[PDB]
Amino acid sequence: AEKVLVTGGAGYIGSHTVLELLEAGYLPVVIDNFHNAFRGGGSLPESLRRVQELTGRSVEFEEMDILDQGALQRLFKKYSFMAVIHFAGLKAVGESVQKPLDYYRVNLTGTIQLLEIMKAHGVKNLVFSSSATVYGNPQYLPLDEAHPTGGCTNPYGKSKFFIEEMIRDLCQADKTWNAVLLRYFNPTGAHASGCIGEDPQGIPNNLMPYVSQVAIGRREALNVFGNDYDTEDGTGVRDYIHVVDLAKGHIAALRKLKEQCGCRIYNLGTGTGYSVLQMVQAMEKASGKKIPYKVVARREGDVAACYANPSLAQEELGWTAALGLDRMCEDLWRWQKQNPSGFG
Numbered sequence: 001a002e003k004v005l006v007t008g009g010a011g012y013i014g015s016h017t018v019l020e021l022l023e024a025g026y027l028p029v030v031i032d033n034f035h036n037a038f039r040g041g042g043s044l045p046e047s048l049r050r051v052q053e054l055t056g057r058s059v060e061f062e063e064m065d066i067l068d069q070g071a072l073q074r075l076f077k078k079y080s081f082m083a084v085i086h087f088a089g090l091k092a093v094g095e096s097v098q099k100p101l102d103y104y105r106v107n108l109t110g111t112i113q114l115l116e117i118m119k120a121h122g123v124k125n126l127v128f129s130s131s132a133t134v135y136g137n138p139q140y141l142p143l144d145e146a147h148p149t150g151g152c153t154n155p156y157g158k159s160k161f162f163i164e165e166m167i168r169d170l171c172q173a174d175k176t177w178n179a180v181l182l183r184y185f186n187p188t189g190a191h192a193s194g195c196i197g198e199d200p201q202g203i204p205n206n207l208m209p210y211v212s213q214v215a216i217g218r219r220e221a222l223n224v225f226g227n228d229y230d231t232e233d234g235t236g237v238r239d240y241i242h243v244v245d246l247a248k249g250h251i252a253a254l255r256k257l258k259e260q261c262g263c264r265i266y267n268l269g270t271g272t273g274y275s276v277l278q279m280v281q282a283m284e285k286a287s288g289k290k291i292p293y294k295v296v297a298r299r300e301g302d303v304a305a306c307y308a309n310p311s312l313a314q315e316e317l318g319w320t321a322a323l324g325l326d327r328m329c330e331d332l333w334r335w336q337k338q339n340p341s342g343f344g
């Protein structure tokens with residue numbers, strides 16, 4: 001019985017991916033330090049306790065920090081892993097500008113320690129959950145895997161790019177390593193049960209949490225940062241992927257490892273961007289509520305449009321996103337109605 005290690009598996013994308021692993025016939029072991037996840041009333045995170053109910057299957061779980069070398073060494077002795085899916089990290093773009101050293105420590109030192117322990121136990125199969133912010137500001141659209149990387153505008157994006165480079169160098173040095181790097185933008189929606197979803201976040205990377213709070217009556221109006229961009233309706237165009245489609249993409253990457261693929265890089269996305277006004281309109285339709293907005297000045301450094309081309313993932317992973325904007329909103333709204341303050 002070889003297992004799949006999911007780091008950061010209590011969090012938003014991780015919990016959905018643990019569910020998809022169980023549905024695809026894998027045996028998951030999760031590690032998390034609860035930096036940004038909710039504890040349940042027993043040993044499991046609440047997200048994972050609910051995953052067990054949804055699937056009828058067990059999730060093994062260890063509370064630990066990826067920065068703890070001794071804890072990681074013990075973990076790889078206790079369990080026999082075939083692969084690792086790596087989500088443990090800090091990910092709030094706005095926070096990374098204020099506290100860059102925390103981002104570099106957790107993301108870079110954590111990942112380096114993970115890679116070293118993997119090597120030491122002969123586990124040379126990795127899915128790395130990257131960010132399409134590694135492309136920097138678009139030079140052409142949609143962004144494909146040939147687009148320049150490294151022009152990054154904030155410490156979070158830099159940390160993701162640096163990790164990618166370290167993995168590419170590892171794979172150059174040892175051709176027996178297989179690693180899939182997945183680049184995407186903004187996860188939204190929730191499992192269709194409504195029982196798991198994104199918990200309330202301190203510093204969101206996208207507008208949908210704010211929109212969801214306006215719709216339930218906890219904020220007055222969405223601030224729209226600029227309506228004079230070179231876009232169809234003047235508001236910013238951004239890339240949103242349903243978290244369930246994203247989680248399935250991570251399973252497709254895991255399967256690709258078995259082909260002895262070496263180092264591969266794929267974008268995940270729907271292939272179409274959505275404006276601020278489109279997102280507002282879709283949530284109004286899903287929720288049946290009015291969502292007031294106020295146009296304010298642009299945020300310094302924002303671009304008109306940014307979205308990814310997912311064509312390579314279709315060709316080489318056999319993967320497409322099936323769930324569109326209306327479904328993202330419907331599934332988000334269901335999670336909010338059933339869990340207005342998240343797991344708490």
Ligand SMILES: NC(=O)c1ccc[n+]([C@@H]2O[C@H](COP(=O)([O-])OP(=O)(O)OC[C@H]3O[C@@H](n4cnc5c(N)ncnc54)[C@H](O)[C@@H]3O)[C@@H](O)[C@H]2O)c1
Nearest residue numbers: 008011012013032033034035036037065066087088089091
């Ligand atoms: N949410 C996004 O906007 C987005 C976009 C692109 C990529 N990502 C990537 O996805 C991953 C997770 O995203 P998410 O949105 O599910 O966030 P999340 O915060 O919900 O999940 C990350 C999990 O990692 C845990 N964690 C953090 N530091 C840890 C540490 N030192 N040791 C152990 N566990 C630790 C947190 O407690 C949390 O449960 C990260 O790799 C992130 O860079 C996120």
Ligand SMILES: Cc1cc(NC(=O)NCCC(=O)Nc2ccncc2)no1
Nearest residue numbers: 206207210221222223224225226236276
């Ligand atoms: C590309 C883009 C995004 C965007 N708007 C957005 O993300 N808004 C969410 C945050 C927000 O409204 N904050 C806020 C509101 C009121 N008082 C204080 C803070 N506009 O363009």
